[PDB]
Amino acid sequence: RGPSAFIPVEEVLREVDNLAVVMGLHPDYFTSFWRLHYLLLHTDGPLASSWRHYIAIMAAARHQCSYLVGSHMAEFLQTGGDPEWLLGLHRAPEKLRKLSEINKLLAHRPWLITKEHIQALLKTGEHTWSLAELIQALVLLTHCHSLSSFVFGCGILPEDMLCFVEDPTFGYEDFTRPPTFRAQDYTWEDHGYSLIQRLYPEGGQLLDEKFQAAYSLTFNTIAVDTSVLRRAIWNYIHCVFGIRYDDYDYGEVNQLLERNLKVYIKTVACYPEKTTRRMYNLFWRHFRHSEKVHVNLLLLEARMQAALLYALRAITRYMT
Amino acid sequence: FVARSIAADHKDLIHDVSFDFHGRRMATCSSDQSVKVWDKSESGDWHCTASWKTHSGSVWRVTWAHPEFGQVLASCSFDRTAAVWEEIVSHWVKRTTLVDSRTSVTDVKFAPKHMGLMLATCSADGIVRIYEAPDVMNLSQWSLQHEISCKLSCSCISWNPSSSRAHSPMIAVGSDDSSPNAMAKVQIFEYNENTRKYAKAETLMTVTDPVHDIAFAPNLGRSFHILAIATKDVRIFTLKPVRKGPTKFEIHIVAQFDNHNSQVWRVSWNITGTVLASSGDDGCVRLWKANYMDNWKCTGILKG
């Protein structure tokens, strides 16, 4: 009846005004997320505001999230947008109808992004992109995707889409059904930070500050230590997308993760439109309600990092 | 005439000095990755009013913009970037950053006011790019429009300051590479209103030694164009359109002076386009003028 259809209203009371109250249960992370959102969507920058809200609309409509799409179209109407643009993708100019190919790959199959897509986007012509103008759009798209995943995962109540998307039946296909991404040849901390800082400094600083808030988040009722099962869930979700760590022994994944949680993670990440209440209740039956939110936050961070690393590797291969 | 010294307080060499549109402010950039702005008081003394770190490498050039758009400055650096600064009510803030280059960016130049708010940059890889700001009320939204590609390494660019409606926009770009071969070092590109693209127009074959700076002349009344080049010597050219693709020009030569017996580094015209100033390796500034018989004499030798 209140904020979330899954978390009971009494729990929320004891522990876009709905997402903000369901995510507020971990204060040290909310501040960082709001800072990044304010930078990405409100502060002046290389792209116009209306274009930014349209990008948000396009990104949120991949996973079919009504909440975000409604909020962002409401915001877009009041910043000076063209009402004609809301009839479909085919009415927008031929500079936003180029991001529509990288959209699918970043949302569904990150491992297929190559340098030819970047070259197609930056090729000389009558409607081109600059590097800053495009590095902002990439981060915006990833942010909207992860937000949609979390919103569906926690089951948030309120208070068309088929016209904003091309190839509506792409979806996700399992990885094993392509070379493996060794997580020591291209690491965020050593490689991606520097590039994203040179091309877009403030965003890089804010993302690095947001990555370190989802690491120092303790688990109250575990029963080894908190640092172990966190590593397990993080490595599992990275391995789903095609990244394998060299130092980690992958056997402990089963010995540390119940088989019920392993399905909730995959459902909420890969196909977030099919998550339901029974799934939410199957795993961790006798545990506190403020941990099934921490799991969602970890998942969101992991998806963001995987997509960003793939895109940055593509850009670096293009520029070398 | 009279020479007065200024205490710059720069920790390394100074690479550029620029005046403003109303003639009472000045900007200096150095290799200590800094930019300084100077003002002139009623007593006629220059004193600094701002200084701030601008890039992470050596800053080569700094240029002003028209006072219709505000107090705006642009810079280029060894770290392959270009920045736009504005003064708000008094410190200077950063508005944009252009990072498409793969090598060092060498020169930056603002377009004449009647085209809008445009910027042109040149690199050491041979690529010249032209940007634009479609909405003057936000100085943080630039968009790439055109991209030329020369065959050699660029060192300097210059716009045509003519304001006539019978002249199409043009830009001249020069090279500086020393090669054992003999290839043309100066090229001119022109805009085509029908095809909406910049196209090659002429090539200055005679120039073969490395170039260091070029500069068009302020038109104000004429039907042809004047160009100045700073190679090993001082050269002045003339381009006159022929009566009516790229327009056809008749290129001639009107002056050549080896009076520096050194290498010429800089050139600068005056506000009316009648006197040319040149600087060389000896350390002296020389002034050139033309009489009614079209002969170019010397007018003065200024020594530091």
Place this chain on the structure above:
Amino acid sequence: GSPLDVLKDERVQYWIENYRNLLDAWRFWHKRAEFDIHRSKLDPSSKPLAQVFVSCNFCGKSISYSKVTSCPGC
């Protein structure tokens, strides 16, 4: 330093307005402004003069109280 209850009696205001009109008649215009400052400092009940204001051509809103040059609204 009278209380706000007595300054709202519609007999003190009549006296103040009559004095201001007398000052206007003699063409003592800077003295009247001097009095107005010292009366607005003490008595905050009365509002100052109402006049015109400039409005934006694209909104219709007021430009009274982020380029200094642009409209604060649009």
